[PDB]
Design a binder for these strands. Structure first.
Lengths: 63, 63
DNA sequence: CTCACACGTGGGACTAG
DNA sequence: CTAGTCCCACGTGTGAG
């Protein structure tokens, strides 16, 4: 039963979710992801602010 | 000594990272995605994407 | 303690024999 | 049926502070 690999595999898989996610804040220019309620530089929070630098960025109507 | 049952501490906390991936999905452009090689619609595979957009949105107009 | 975390695990679409 | 892929998510033993 390939769960034997599914391990070696679904690890590589769950890993991808990291390399990249890592590589988001890795260069979230918006360094405020450095300064706030941030209870963890690893997933969630970083991603909360990760959507943020974009959230600033999606400003499309300069007066 | 909830060193087993503390359980919920994971997902009840994980939930954020879920939607973090999700708001990361709200301000990302489907219309963009055509550029990106389809990976599969996953809670990992698209963290890949938010980078793409972001890495991009930065140098907007530069020529 | 409270956090955050990476492992296995059963797994349920989907596909190729 | 049989198993090989996908990627989802829970339940945890652990380090860290």
């Amino acid at each position: 039963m390939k769960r034997e690999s599914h391990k070696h595999a679904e690890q590589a898989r769950r890993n991808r979710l990291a390399v990249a996610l890592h590589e988001l804040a890795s260069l979230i220019p918006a360094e405020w992801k450095q300064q706030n309620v941030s209870a963890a530089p690893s997933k969630a929070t970083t991603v909360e602010a990760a959507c943020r630098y974009i959230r600033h960025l999606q400003q499309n109507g300069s007066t």
